[PDB]
Design a binder for this molecule. Structure first.
Ligand code: ADN
Length: 499
């Protein structure tokens, strides 16, 4: 239909229902559409035309979703900066963006000043009253809400998400965005949803909000994940979905307030983005008490690639918690060797994917794009193996593989064996220098609750008799905690091992 057409049709289908809900503001579908139309006119009145870059700096307010959609309705290129990014990383993105405008949240004017000092930008605009540039919400306030039709090229990029790559802005056009929408309906089920987005509107949260609106639903916004707030919100706002990082799942399931929370409105807790720990997902199932969990494997480059359904989490005759599920309709998966050759089902190699959800490409990085997408196939930089039912099992990121005297030890697979043991809650496996074998296998393991001394020889034996001898951790370190990224922090583990 056209992506922005899909979004607007959803909002019209929900004209009298709630569409954008935060702690501070609640808009109906019709109200949301009006704000979009008038914000779009305000932006066009500032001189913005199709293909103009619009860089933003905001949190997850209603104003932010409105802005994101309005920018794209014009056919401009939305480039959202995450607040969490370092100021210097922000400047770099801003410099690279060829920005025709910079739109910032008033709250954040200090940092906006730093950035614009580094990278002077025309059309500085604020989401409300603020020191720098003009007040976009004021300007939108005073335009007509007469509809603005999308007339730009469905194929030209309207959004740039920062944090692809295995820095990197990932360009997305309406075409690939609509395909992502269609896939989300397969994963999340038919709309309307009441979808708790606590992920940045700057990128993935913003996409999920778009899809929610497009399928006729309500976006329930939070700035970030805090388990007590989320448990309360699910009940108070009657959410059908909340998209989680795997660790968030475990925090919900283990929280003391879970008993008192009302989860009855949930249809799903879709999760992914980082490797799950199967045994911890198994505990979460039990604690939640019904098949809510849906495992989602995707990337900014690839869109949605596979999903494991809620019912496949509890399939009677299989155990699939170490799988990321099966291909989305329309998605082809090939598992390839180092030379690019397709491997028979069952073999480990690089996960490569072809679908209409593929990104347009990396913003201004043509060499890397041609390296990453070859003959229409995304090379994910993940390693894995399919089975005869079509389930995909990720065994490593290519960069994490540990080479022990010419043998390949897949760190995530070893981790799953360790965490599978009842004594082990969490594990991280990394390679360290070895005089004899070049690399040796190092594992850090966090004991489970009610576990005393880990039997390290038991753990080595389990790995040995599941994967084979070379997969065994030579070095096995009991730790209190596994360091994290802003994924588990494998470089940090590698470093702390020397000392
Ligand atoms: N559900 C998931 N399970 C494991 N790793 C994932 C999942 N979703 C995303 N990833 C990882 O993060 C990357 C996305 O930027 C993937 O290519 C993959 O390595």
């Amino acid at each position: 239909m056209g992506y922005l057409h899909r979004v607007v049709e959803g909002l019209k289908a929900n004209a009298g229902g709630e569409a954008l809900v935060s702690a501070d503001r609640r808009l109906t579908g019709a109200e949301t559409l009006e704000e979009i139309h008038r914000t779009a006119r305000a932006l066009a009145a500032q001189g913005l035309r199709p293909g103009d870059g619009v860089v933003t700096l905001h949190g997850n307010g209603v104003e932010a979703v409105v802005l994101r959609i309005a920018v794209q309705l014009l056919g401009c290129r939305y480039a959202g900066l995450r607040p969490v990014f370092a100021t210097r990383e922000k400047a770099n993105f801003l410099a690279e963006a060829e920005a025709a405008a910079f739109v910032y949240q008033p709250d954040m004017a200090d940092e906006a000043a730093e950035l614009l000092r580094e990278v002077p930008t025309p059309r500085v605009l604020s989401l409300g009253p603020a020191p720098l540039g003009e007040d976009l919400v004021a300007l939108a306030g005073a335009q007509s809400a007469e509809p603005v039709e999308f007339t730009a090229d469905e194929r030209a990029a309207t959004a740039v998400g920062f944090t692809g790559g295995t820095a990197k802005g990932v360009c997305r056009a309406p075409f690939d965005l609509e395909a992502c929408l269609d896939a989300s309906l397969t994963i999340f089920g038919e709309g309307p949803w009441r979808f708790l987005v606590c992920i940045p509107i700057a990128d993935l949260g913003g996409e999920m909000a778009e899809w929610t609106l497009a399928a006729g639903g309500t976006v329930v916004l939070r700035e970030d994940f805090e388990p007590a707030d989320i448990l309360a919100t699910i009940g108070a706002e009657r959410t059908t979905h909340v998209f989680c990082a795997p660790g968030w799942v475990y925090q919900l399931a283990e929280h003391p307030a879970l008993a008192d929370a009302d989860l009855s409105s949930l249809t799903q807790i879709p999760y992914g983005g980082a490797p799950s720990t199967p045994a911890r997902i198994a505990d979460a199932l039990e604690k939640l008490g019904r098949p809510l969990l849906v495992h989602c494997y995707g990337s900014q480059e690839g869109g949605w690639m596979t999903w494991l359904s809620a019912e496949d989490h509890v399939r009677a005759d299989r155990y699939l918690l170490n799988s990321v599920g099966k291909a989305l309709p329309g998605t082809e998966i090939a598992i390839r060797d180092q030379d690019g050759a397709d491997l028979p089902v069952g073999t480990v190699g690089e996960v490569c994917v072809r679908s209409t959800m593929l990104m347009r490409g990396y913003w201004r990085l043509p060499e890397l794009t041609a390296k990453t997408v070859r003959d229409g196939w995304l090379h994910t930089g993940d390693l894995g193996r399919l089975d005869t039912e079509g389930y995909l099992y990720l065994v490593d990121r290519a960069k994490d593989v540990i080479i022990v005297e010419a043998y390949n030890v897949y760190s995530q697979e070893v981790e799953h064996v360790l965490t599978g043991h009842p004594d082990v809650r969490y594990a991280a496996v990394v390679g360290v220098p070895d005089h004899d074998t070049t690399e040796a296998v190092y594992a850090a393991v966090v004991p489970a609750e009610g576990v005393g001394e880990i039997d390290v020889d038991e753990l080595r034996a389990l790995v040995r008799t599941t994967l084979g001898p070379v997969h065994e951790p030579k070095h096995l370190d009991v730790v209190d905690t596994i360091p994290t990224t802003p994924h588990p922090d494998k470089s940090a583990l590698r470093t702390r091992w020397r000392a």
